């Protein structure tokens, strides 16, 4: 996250970090005790993945961390149907053992298609993660978070040559300097509705980071909540 | 109605008969007494911060 600030322990208890062939390479959000939702470009199979909930400072021990193994990965069925479009950038990870919910490990709320969109339209969400704090720069040790304003789709489209599908939305500032960045992918774009946070987006892509005239591109969660609920049922 | 202020529902609103309004909440929550606000029904309901907001305090 570029231009954000440190989060406080327990401020985003639904946030998890993913580790694999590369350490802290992407983020994710707790759907429930056995499932995490992330970005599909983060988990192109062919590698083992570990999830850490209750994480705050990557290099220290807080005694709130819960590490779990990923036994199943389900990328959206239409992800990569076309090459390099980043459309449908979302995936689910099933855990080997269930997380123990507590103050530092809490699920993010997910409304129906109707209300997820309504909440997105409030126009102000929070993004967080351990990704790069500077374009092409180093990554964060302490979790970062940034409030980002929704960008009108019409201006969103005119800001890039690439295609912004109906499964995406732009968020960021016209002046630049503040943005999510490489390494934050899969992490949540959330909307706080009177003290309760709902997942409204998935950090997905961009053109460089924090560049004036450019905005962060996010997966529009409202278009995928039926699918999420359908695949993460507990028995 | 749900027309203005989400029909005075803390989370979800849906139009009822005679232009009435029925409020609802997400999982882990229960509809309060006032029929509009939502209250935790489980130990750790989704979407909420439960660590003493910036350092511990007393009320
Ligand atoms: Ca730690």
CA distance A200 to B58: 33
Residue A91, Cβ neighbours under 10 Å: how many?
A: 24
3-class secondary structure per residue, A149-177: EECCHHHHHHCCCCCCCCCEEEECCCCCC
Q: Is A94 annotated as a binding residue?
A: no
Residues with CB under 5 A from ligand 1 (ion): A 57, 62
Q: Which of A7, A218, A212 is nearest to A120 (CA)?
A: A218
Q: Give the distance (Å) from ligand 1 centre to CA of residue A10.
A: 12
| Facing residue for A107 by CB, picked from B10, B46, B54 | B46
Q: Is B5 left (phi over 0), alpha (psi -120 to 50) or beta?
A: left
Contact yes or no for A98/A34 (Cβ under 8 A): yes
Class level of CATH domain A1-12+108-222: mainly beta
Which secondary structure element, helix H or strand E, spans residue A37, and what is its range?
A: strand A35-38
A88, A89, A179, A197: the catalytic one is: A89
Domain ranges of chain A: 1-12+108-222, 13-107+223-235
Tell me how far the alpha carbon of residue A56 lies from the centroid of ligand 1, in angstroms: 5
What are the DSSP calls for A83-102, one per residue? TT--TT--EEEEESS----B
Element (H, E) at A193: strand A188-193
CB-based burial label for A215 (10 Å; 0-12, 13-18, 19+): buried
Resolution (A): 2.0
CA distance A88 to A133: 26
With beta carbons less than 8 A apart as the criterion, state whether A88 and A40 touch.
Answer: yes
Q: Characterize A53-82 residue by residue with b for buried, 16 or more Cβ atoms within 10 angstroms of its Cβ, and e for exposed.
A: bbbbebeeeeebbbebebeebbbbeebbee
At A203, is the secondary structure helix, strand, or coil?
strand
CATH number of this structure's domain A13-107+223-235, picked from the four choices 1.10.8.60, 3.40.50.620, 2.40.10.10, 3.90.1150.10: 2.40.10.10
CB within 8 A of B53, min separation 6: which ones? none
Tokens of B43: 């130990």
Closest approach of B18 to chain A, Cα-based (Å)? 23
Is residue A58 a contact partner of residue A67, using CB atoms and an 8 Å limit?
no
- How many CB atoms within 10 Å of residue B5? 10
Handedness of CA A104, A107, A111, A117 (dihedral sign): positive
Is residue A230 within 8 Å of residue A76, measured between CB atoms? no
**Method underlying the structure:** X-ray
Q: From CA A128, how far away is CA A12, in angstroms rounded?
A: 8
Handedness of CA A61, A63, A65, A69 (dihedral sign): positive
Q: Which residues from A are below 8 Å from B when comparing CB atoms?
A: 8-11, 13-14, 101-104, 106-111, 115, 190, 193-198
Identify the CATH class of B1-59: mainly beta
Q: Which residues contact A235 (CB under 8 A, 6 or more apart)?
A: none
Query: Of A8, A103, A193, which has the smallest distance from its Cβ to B11's Cβ?
Result: A193
The percent of chain A in helix, strand and coil, each rounded to the nearest 5, is 10, 35, 55
Q: How many helices (H) and strands (E) does chain A have?
A: 3, 13
Q: Is A194 labelled a binding residue? A: no
Q: Which of A103, A111, A190 sits opposite B51 (nearest CB)?
A: A103
CA pair distance B21, B5, nearest whole angstrom: 12
Name residues whose C-beta falls within 8 Å of residue A73's C-beta, 6 or more positions apart in sequence: A43, A45, A49, A91, A92, A93, A94
Q: How far is the C-alpha of B25 from the C-alpha of B23, rounded, in Å? A: 7
A97's tokens: 């053992």
């Amino acid at each position: 996250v570029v231009g954000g600030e440190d989060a406080k322990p327990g401020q985003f208890p639904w946030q998890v970090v993913l580790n694999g062939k590369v350490d802290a390479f992407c983020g994710g959000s707790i759907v429930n005790e056995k499932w995490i939702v992330t970005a599909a470009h983060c988990v192109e199979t062919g590698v083992k993945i570990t999830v850490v909930a209750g994480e705050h400072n990557i290099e220290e021990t807080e005694h709130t961390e819960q590490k779990r193994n990923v036994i199943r990965i389900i990328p959206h069925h239409n992800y990569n149907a076309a090459i390099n479009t980043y459309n449908h950038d979302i995936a689910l990870l099933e855990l080997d053992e269930p997380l123990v919910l507590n103050s530092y490990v809490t699920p993010i709320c997910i409304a129906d298609k109707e209300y997820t969109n309504i909440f997105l339209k409030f126009g102000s969400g929070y993004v967080s993660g351990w990704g790069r704090v500077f374009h092409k720069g180093r990554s964060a040790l302490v979790l970062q978070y940034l409030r980002v304003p929704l960008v009108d789709r019409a201006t969103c489209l005119r800001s890039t040559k690439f295609t912004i599908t109906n499964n995406m939305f732009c968020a960021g500032f016209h002046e630049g300097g503040r943005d999510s960045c490489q390494g934050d992918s899969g992490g949540p774009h959330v909307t706080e509705v009177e003290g309760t946070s709902f997942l409204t987006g998935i950090i997905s892509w961009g053109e460089e980071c924090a560049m004036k005239g450019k905005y962060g591109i996010y997966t529009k969660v409202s278009r995928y909540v039926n699918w999420i609920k359908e695949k993460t049922k507990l028995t | 109605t749900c027309n203005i202020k989400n029909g005075r529902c803390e989370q979800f609103c849906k139009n009822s008969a005679d232009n009435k309004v029925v409020c609802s909440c997400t999982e882990g929550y229960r509809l309060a007494e006032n029929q509009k606000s939502c209250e935790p029904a489980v130990p750790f309901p989704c979407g909420r911060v439960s660590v003493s907001q910036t350092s511990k305090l007393t009320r």
